[PDB]
């Protein structure tokens, strides 16, 4: 069903936009569809959108679009109803398509991407109110819906998609917001991942755990500081790790992948 969503909205929409996490757009490009776009629907559009720009340093996202304007038009963006960024560039952008499709009497646009990226969120801050359902959990929107504005441009919100590539990951599916982290079996074992991603300094500030090594030890300093230990005297490995991995995805620890360098 979840790809039956996807071919539906692609065949439904005229211009597709494609959101991408600013933290690691390369981990989210998910080419795979653009392939189908070029070969079977040449008239359709496929523009990228960089949302969640407020989690990266200023120059970082600046470097990305220069590495992304060479192939796709790629707006940067920050979604919030009350304090956003870059809305009116997109509002200027869309109506041109309604302008160019003059005869077409109206026009759809569907929002494709990974789960937990802001596809539901972006439509809300377009409509300047809550219309999509949103959540910090990944799988929040479940089925596409029409959202009308200006009587010609229609917003469509498919649920998030992961392409079924073999590898290309097993654990970094956790390191995108894909999996609701609760149902996993051993959250203890992915902790050296976030040591490898996040910086030790910024990690040190958010807890405010002083000197450690050997990430199992890193957990056990924390559960003492939280007092989050079981009845005599088991330190919570799992739920603390479940609380850690949320903050890597809900955005309480700062991280990103370094953009490709200029030359």
């Amino acid at each position: 069903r979840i790809w039956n969503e996807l071919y539906k909205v692609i065949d439904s929409s005229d211009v597709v936009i494609h959101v991408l996490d600013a933290r690691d757009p390369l981990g989210t490009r998910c080419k795979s569809v653009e392939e189908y776009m070029k070969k079977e629907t040449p008239h359709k559009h496929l523009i990228y959108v960089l949302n969640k720009c407020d989690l990266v340093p200023t120059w970082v996202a600046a470097a990305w679009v220069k590495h992304l304007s060479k192939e796709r038009p790629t707006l940067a963006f920050h979604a919030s109803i009350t304090n956003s960024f870059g809305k009116g560039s997109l509002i200027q952008l869309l109506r041109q398509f309604s302008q160019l499709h003059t005869d077409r009497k109206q026009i759809s646009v569907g929002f494709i991407g990974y789960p937990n990226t802001g596809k539901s969120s972006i439509i809300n801050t377009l409509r300047k109110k809550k219309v999509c359902q949103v959540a910090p959990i990944p799988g929040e929107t479940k089925v596409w819906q029409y959202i009308t504005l200006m009587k010609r441009i229609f917003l469509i919100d498919c649920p998030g998609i992961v392409p079924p590539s073999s590898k290309d990951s097993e654990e970094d599916i956790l390191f995108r917001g894909v999996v609701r982290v609760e149902h996993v079996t051993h959250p203890e074992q992915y902790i050296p991942g976030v040591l490898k991603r996040c910086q030790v300094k910024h990690l040190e500030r958010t807890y405010e755990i002083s000197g450690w090594k050997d990430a199992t030890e890193f957990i056990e300093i924390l559960a003492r500081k939280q007092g989050r230990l079981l009845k005599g005297g088991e330190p919570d490995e799992s739920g603390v790790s479940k609380q850690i991995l949320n903050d890597f995805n809900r955005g309480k620890i700062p991280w990103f992948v370094l953009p490709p360098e200029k030359e």
Binding site: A76, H202, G251, I253, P254
Partner: peptide
């Protein structure tokens, strides 16, 4: 495309961005 400036956008002040909390 509209031209796009980044002199705006106060980025999200995470706690890990603040030097007020640090160890040493």
């Amino acid at each position: 495309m509209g031209k796009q400036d980044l002199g705006k956008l106060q980025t999200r002040k995470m706690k890990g961005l603040k030097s007020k909390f640090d160890q040493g």
